[PDB]
Design a protein around this motif. Structure first.
Motif, PDB file in Angstrom:
ATOM      1  N   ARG A  66       0.855  -1.190   0.000  1.00  0.00           N
ATOM      2  CA  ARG A  66       0.000   0.000   0.000  1.00  0.00           C
ATOM      3  C   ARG A  66       0.884   1.229   0.000  1.00  0.00           C
ATOM      4  O   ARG A  66       0.758   2.090  -0.868  1.00  0.00           O
ATOM      5  CB  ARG A  66      -0.953   0.045   1.206  1.00  0.00           C
ATOM      6  N   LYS A  95       2.449   2.028  -3.232  1.00  0.00           N
ATOM      7  CA  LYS A  95       1.403   2.684  -4.035  1.00  0.00           C
ATOM      8  C   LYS A  95       1.144   4.161  -3.636  1.00  0.00           C
ATOM      9  O   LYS A  95       0.950   5.030  -4.495  1.00  0.00           O
ATOM     10  CB  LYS A  95       0.091   1.864  -3.989  1.00  0.00           C
ATOM     11  CG  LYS A  95      -1.038   2.354  -4.920  1.00  0.00           C
ATOM     12  CD  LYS A  95      -0.702   2.125  -6.407  1.00  0.00           C
ATOM     13  N   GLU A  96       1.156   4.429  -2.335  1.00  0.00           N
ATOM     14  CA  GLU A  96       0.946   5.772  -1.819  1.00  0.00           C
ATOM     15  C   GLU A  96       2.129   6.670  -2.176  1.00  0.00           C
ATOM     16  O   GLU A  96       1.957   7.853  -2.489  1.00  0.00           O
ATOM     17  CB  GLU A  96       0.729   5.762  -0.290  1.00  0.00           C
ATOM     18  N   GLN A 154       4.001   6.376  -4.844  1.00  0.00           N
ATOM     19  CA  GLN A 154       4.015   6.682  -6.284  1.00  0.00           C
ATOM     20  C   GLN A 154       2.918   7.678  -6.634  1.00  0.00           C
ATOM     21  O   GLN A 154       3.005   8.385  -7.626  1.00  0.00           O
ATOM     22  CB  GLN A 154       3.869   5.433  -7.133  1.00  0.00           C
ATOM     23  CG  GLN A 154       4.487   4.251  -6.522  1.00  0.00           C
ATOM     24  CD  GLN A 154       4.044   2.989  -7.193  1.00  0.00           C
ATOM     25  OE1 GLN A 154       3.446   2.105  -6.551  1.00  0.00           O
ATOM     26  NE2 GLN A 154       4.309   2.893  -8.504  1.00  0.00           N
ATOM     27  N   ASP A 155       1.888   7.715  -5.798  1.00  0.00           N
ATOM     28  CA  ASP A 155       0.771   8.631  -5.982  1.00  0.00           C
ATOM     29  C   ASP A 155       1.169  10.019  -5.502  1.00  0.00           C
ATOM     30  O   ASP A 155       0.802  11.037  -6.116  1.00  0.00           O
ATOM     31  CB  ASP A 155      -0.456   8.153  -5.190  1.00  0.00           C
ATOM     32  CG  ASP A 155      -1.045   6.848  -5.733  1.00  0.00           C
ATOM     33  OD1 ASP A 155      -0.863   6.497  -6.951  1.00  0.00           O
ATOM     34  OD2 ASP A 155      -1.710   6.180  -4.906  1.00  0.00           O
TER      35      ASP A 155
END
Ligand code: ZN
Length: 254
Positions: free
Chosen positions: A183, A186-187, A189-190
């Protein structure tokens, strides 16, 4: 040898004490997961002055008990007068903010002067020069950072939050306080996209595979930015090392 025997926990403590202590004493060095060896401990008890940063970092400094070991070492928490921020448990990484590195050198001077009153003035003068060099550094980069085309960056860990407050910048660490789930990957890269960050900053002595992958999949360049937690190669003073790193940052946010 000459003067007092002074021990320090890690590079920023070593270099601040060394520059403040000038040529008067004997200054030596012994991080998030570090426990002292039996040799480190013995050498602490053997010293006149052991300088560490915060019990929030070198937690083990508190387990020291000079009373039992009938030792007369002065265990000295150099960041006590500093207000630390909460994560974000507190964030210890004050040393990368030039101003706060200053307050702490000034504090280490005060203590050296308690231990050795004859050279009190001398410690003080060295601290003042350090302080006043830290302020020229803050100012130069306060100018530089208000005219960059990118005010956000990502670093291998959350070690630059204070540097970032100081210069109106925004940071996110791939790891947290200490050197990330699926997670969190993912966070991160966001975060990189939301803020359009063009550089992910690895650090020497931490495996860069995860920063490269984030950078790769995100169109960003990997580069190196040191928290000054490990000692730098070369012969620069603490603030010369801090400057070279502010300048990598700015070269990249330029
Ligand atoms: Zn750190």
């Amino acid at each position: 040898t000459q003067g007092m025997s002074v021990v320090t926990s890690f590079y920023p403590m070593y270099a601040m004490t060394k520059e403040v202590s000038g040529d008067l004493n004997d200054v030596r060095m012994i991080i998030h997961s570090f426990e002292p060896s039996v040799n480190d401990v013995a050498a602490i008890y053997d010293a006149d002055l052991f300088v560490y940063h915060s019990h929030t970092l070198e937690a083990w400094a508190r387990d020291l008990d000079p009373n039992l070991k009938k030792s007369k070492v002065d265990v000295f928490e150099a960041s006590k007068p500093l207000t630390l921020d909460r994560v974000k448990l507190y964030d210890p990484h004050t040393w990368t903010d030039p101003v706060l590195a200053g307050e702490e050198a000034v504090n280490i001077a005060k203590e050296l002067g308690r231990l050795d009153p004859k050279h009190k003035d001398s410690y003080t003068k060295n601290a003042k020069a350090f302080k006043k060099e830290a302020e020229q550094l803050t100012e130069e980069y306060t100018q530089k950072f208000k005219k960059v085309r990118s005010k956000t960056f990502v670093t291998q860990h959350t070690a630059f939050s204070y540097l970032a407050k100081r210069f109106g910048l925004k940071q996110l660490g791939i790891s947290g306080i200490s050197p990330p789930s699926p997670r969190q990957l993912k966070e991160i890269q966001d975060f990189v996209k939301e803020y359009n960050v063009k550089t992910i900053f690895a650090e020497d002595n931490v495996n860069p595979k995860i920063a490269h992958a984030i950078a790769k999949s995100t169109g960003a360049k990997v580069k190196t930015l040191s928290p000054l937690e490990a000692a730098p190669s070369g012969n620069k003073t603490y603030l010369e090392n801090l400057r070279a790193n502010l300048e990598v940052l700015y070269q990249q946010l330029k």
